[PDB]
Amino acid sequence: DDLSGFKKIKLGELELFILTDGYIHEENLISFAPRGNVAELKTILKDNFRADHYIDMAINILLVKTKEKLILMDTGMGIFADERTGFLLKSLQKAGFSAHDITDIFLSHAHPDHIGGVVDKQNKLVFPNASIFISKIEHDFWINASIKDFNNSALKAHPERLNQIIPALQNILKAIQPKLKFYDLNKTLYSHFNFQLAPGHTPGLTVTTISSGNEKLMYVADLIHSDVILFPHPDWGFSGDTDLDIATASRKKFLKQLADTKARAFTSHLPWPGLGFTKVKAPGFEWIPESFMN
Ligand SMILES: CCCCCC(=O)N[C@@H](CCO)C(=O)O
Ligand SMILES: [Zn+2]
Ligand SMILES: [Zn+2]
Pocket test for ligand 1, best of 113, 169, 268 (most atoms within 8 A of CB): 113
What ranges do the domains of the chain cover? 1-294
Residue 69 to residue 124: CA distance in whole angstroms: 22
Helix, strand or coil, per DSSP, at residue 61: strand
Q: Which amino acid, residue 201?
A: H
Pocket test for ligand 1, best of 111, 220, 222 (most atoms within 8 A of CB): 111
The answer to whether the CB of 162 is under 6 A from ligand 1 is yes
Header resolution in angstroms = 1.7
Q: Encode 129-167: b = buried (16+ Cβ within 10 Å), e = exposed.
A: ebbbbbbebbbebbeebeeebbeebbbeeeeeebeebbe
The per-type count for the chain, helices as H runs and strands as E runs, is 7, 13
Cross-strand pairs, 189:
193
Please return the burial class of 213, using the count of CB atoms within 10 Å of its CB with bins 0-12, 13-18 and 19+.
Answer: exposed
Please return the burial class of 180, using the count of CB atoms within 10 Å of its CB with bins 0-12, 13-18 and 19+.
Answer: middle
Residue 294 to residue 30: CA distance in whole angstroms: 35
The answer to whether 103 and 130 have CB atoms below 8 angstroms apart is yes
Q: Check the chain for breaks (C–N over 2.5 Å) and list the residue before each, or none.
A: none
CATH, domain range 1-294: 3.60.15.10
Query: Hey, how many other C-beta atoms are within 10 angstroms of the C-beta on 19?
Result: 29
- Of residues 91, 57, 65, 69, the one with CA closest to residue 9: 65
The answer to whether 205 and 138 have CB atoms below 8 angstroms apart is yes
The answer to whether the CB of 224 is under 6 A from ligand 1 is no
- Of residues 35, 43, 42, the one with CA closest to residue 235: 35
